[PDB]
Design a binder for this molecule. Structure first.
Ligand SMILES: CC(C)CN(C[C@@H](O)[C@H](Cc1ccccc1)NC(=O)O[C@H]1CO[C@H]2OCC[C@H]21)S(=O)(=O)c1ccc(N)cc1
Ligand SMILES: [Cl-]
Ligand SMILES: [Cl-]
Ligand code: NA
Lengths: 99, 99
């Protein structure tokens, strides 16, 4: 699809069996999702942006379906105010910025 | 251009005669740049990012060049980790997300 940016580029994602809304975010390095349980091992990480840092759990090799497209990669889980699909998974679905 | 996301989508901007690096950020509503002097009056604004809220200075109708495309619009000035070009100016230069 071609998504204009008049509004927030929100899409539906499926992760851990759950449906969620998420923002497509070229300004983010790693995908960050609101608190949920995921399978497998994790390790702690701090990630930072405007307003400072939050502590997250880093899970590797997690599958997410993004707007109908399957991608696999690292997912961070913690108290983010919005679900963010970042460049680590946007590359996998072939997403580009065009102007 | 067509910009892939394997690396940070950094571009050169020109504001007040000065070149700076900025990140093209579809996950941002308004454009935020590190402290610098801009002409005219400013209005208060709070913006909420990943780690909480911060106060910035809002300047309206600022001329900015972005990767060679001219935009004129609202620029926020405050303690951001990196200069971010958000959807309010990405729409002015005709940017879209594609996959
Ligand atoms: C500041 C950027 C360098 C990085 N951020 C991604 C960015 O797109 C966030 C994504 C975002 C979006 C909503 C809330 C929090 C974070 N947008 C943002 O902070 O925009 C602020 C300015 O315009 C406003 O509209 C959105 C909030 C304001 S970040 O959320 O802090 C972040 C940092 C590291 C990772 N791995 C994932 C995300
Ligand atoms: Cl990854
Ligand atoms: Cl103030
Ligand atoms: Na894992």
């Amino acid at each position: 699809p071609q998504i204009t940016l008049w509004k927030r580029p929100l899409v539906t994602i499926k992760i851990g069996g759950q449906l969620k809304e998420a923002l497509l975010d070229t300004g983010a390095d790693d995908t960050v999702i609101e608190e949920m349980s995921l399978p497998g091992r994790w390790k702690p990480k701090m990630i930072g942006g405007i307003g400072g840092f939050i502590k997250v759990r880093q899970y590797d090799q997690i599958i997410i379906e993004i707007a109908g497209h399957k991608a696999i990669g690292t997912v961070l889980v913690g108290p983010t105010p919005v679900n963010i699909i970042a460049r680590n998974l946007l590359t996998q679905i072939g997403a580009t910025l065009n102007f």
